[PDB]
Structures are given as C-alpha cells and as structure tokens.
Amino acid sequence: VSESQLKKMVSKYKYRDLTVRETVNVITLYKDLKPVLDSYVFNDGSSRELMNLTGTIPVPYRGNTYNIPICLWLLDTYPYNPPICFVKPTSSMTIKTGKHVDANGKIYLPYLHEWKHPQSDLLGLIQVMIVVFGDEPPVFS
C-alpha cells in the first residue's frame, strides 16, 4: 500500500523513481500483487534486502480463472536487469514443469532473456506471463 511507504522500501535502490513508477503502474492494474521488502538469500549464501512483488495474477484457462501465486524479486539495479521470477505453489497446487517453469518454480520467458530498459517493464512482463500461462499452465490443482 501507499506511494510514500513504497518510496521508503526502495530507498537503497540505485534507480528509485523508475522502480517506484513501474511498481505503481503494476499494482494499479493487478491489485492482488503487493510490494514487500525481504532478504533474498542467493545460492552462494550471501543475502540482500530486496523489494519483491508478491500475490497472484489472473490467468483464464478452460473457462475458469486461476489466480497463480508469483514472486517477482527486483535486484537493486532494477530496471536495468530483469526480475527473478517464481511461481509459488500452495499445498493444493503442483508445478507442471515445462518450457516456462522448472521444478523449483523458476520462470523462463523470452521477455526475461531479452530484457532491456526502457522497452521492458514490469507491466509488460506480467501481461506476457498471463498470455504464456494461459496456453501453457504452470500449475494444476
């Protein structure tokens, strides 16, 4: 919540204004995503406090709407490097691994591999995710 609270959570980001604006634009359209500050521990055991977007995105499939839980972690160089993106299954969900999601929930898309500011942004990423996941569901009940 709140633009002021948001600016505070990204205070240590090199490109605060850009990150804030992209984030506002995302959560304006996608109201079940929310910005949170948490420590991310990388595979080498180092740790950084990063802002992430966490929540669900709506994905129509076979007549129903599936609210897929994701996490989009922004590196402190955002928006010049892409988010680290994960599907976060709940106890009622199994990951269906495939071209765009591995066994860990890591997401793979052309939008991420070809990421370049300013043409790439969070909103763009999310809509691509929704298109891809609508044809190739990353979870099942």
Partner 1 sequence: MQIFVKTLTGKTITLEVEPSDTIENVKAKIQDKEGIPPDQQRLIFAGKQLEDGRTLSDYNIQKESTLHLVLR
Chain residues in the site for Cu ion (CB under 5 A): 99
What number of chain residues touch partner 1 (CB under 8 A)?
A: 22
Q: Give the nearer residue to partner 1 in terms of CB position, either 11 or 43.
A: 43
Least distance CB 33 / partner 1 (angstroms)? 17
Question: Which residues lie across from 68 on neighbouring strands?
Answer: 57
Can you read off the two tokens belonging to residue 113? 């591999």
Residue from 29, 36, 41, 131 touching partner 1 (CB under 8 A): that is: 41
- 65: contact with partner 1 by CB under 8 A: no
Which helix (H) or strand (E) segment holds residue 135: the answer is helix 122-135
Q: Which does 75 bind (CB under 5 to 8 A by kind): Cu ion, partner 1, none?
A: none
| DSSP tally for the chain: helices H, then strands E | 4, 6
95 near partner 1 (CB under 8 A): yes
Q: Are the C-beta atoms of 12 and 49 separated by less than 8 Å?
A: yes
Q: For residues 78 and 86, which CB has a smaller minimum distance to partner 1 in the complex?
A: 86
Four-residue CA torsion sign, 100, 101, 102, 108: positive
| 124 class by beta-carbon count within 10 Å (0-12 exposed, 13-18 middle, 19+ buried) | middle
CB of 108 to Cu ion, least distance (A): 9
Question: Which spans of this chain sit near partner 1 (rule: CB under 8 A)?
Answer: 40-45, 71, 73, 84, 86, 88-91, 93-95, 97, 103-106
